[PDB]
């Protein structure tokens, strides 16, 4: 889906949407395309262990340094372990192999840290296969998060704005600096235009999706 996302972003950025004669950004809004899943908190502990994260349904996950993943569902008991080749296993906290005790303990450490310290992004949105974090990286400006359902999320450090790109819907959700959450069809952004701030962030997103492709 990354190449589809790249093509969608190219088409919208090529149209120079902030130069529309009259920009009508609101006409591009499509609340039906609001994503089900996004990353609502995260902690990069990759100097030792890896990247812990919360999804907006309050499930939590870790992408460990060895490229395995452990997901704890929002019931607090169901687990999914994903090996580095994508092989999935389904377990529980109450019945799991002893070989996973260290990673379960680490996941619990991340879950508790994020609960005690970090603000939930998108908490104002009222509530599908649960995705896992496929890969991530940071730049000077942002963290880029690639989920296994094809979504790409980009969180900008300076001003707290966020994009959630969904190539299946050809849509982008933008959370602005006031924490207002709006979802747009990319083709309608091409038609109706958008403000310079969003246009600028969609240009940066194309660059970031390009880096993911490699």
């Amino acid at each position: 889906h990354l190449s589809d996302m790249l093509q969608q972003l190219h088409s919208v950025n090529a149209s120079k949407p902030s130069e529309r004669g009259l920009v009508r950004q609101e006409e591009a809004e499509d609340p039906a395309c609001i994503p089900i899943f996004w990353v609502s908190k995260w902690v990069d502990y990759s100097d030792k262990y890896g990247l812990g994260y919360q999804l907006c349904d309050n499930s939590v996950g870790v992408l460990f340094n060895d490229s395995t993943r452990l997901i704890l569902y929002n019931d607090g008991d169901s687990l999914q372990y994903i090996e580095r080749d994508g092989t999935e296993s389904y377990l529980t906290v109450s019945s799991h192999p002893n070989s996973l005790m260290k990673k379960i303990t680490l996941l619990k450490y991340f879950r508790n840290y994020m609960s005690e310290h970090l603000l939930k992004a998108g908490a104002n949105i009222t509530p599908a296969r649960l995705p896992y974090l496929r890969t991530w990286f940071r730049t000077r400006s942002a963290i880029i998060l690639h989920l296994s359902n094809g979504s790409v999320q980009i969180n900008f450090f300076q001003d707290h704005t966020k994009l959630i790109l969904c190539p299946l819907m050809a849509a982008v959700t933008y959370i602005d600096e006031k924490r207002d959450f709006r979802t747009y069809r990319l083709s309608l952004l091409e038609e109706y235009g958008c403000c310079k701030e969003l246009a600028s962030r969609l240009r940066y997103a194309r660059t970031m999706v390009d880096k993911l492709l490699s």
């Binding site: 995260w42 902690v43 990069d44 310290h117 970090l118 603000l119 707290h160």
Partner: peptide, 5 residues
């Protein structure tokens, strides 16, 4: 880390 509460 993401942002603080």
């Amino acid at each position: 880390q993401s942002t603080x509460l």
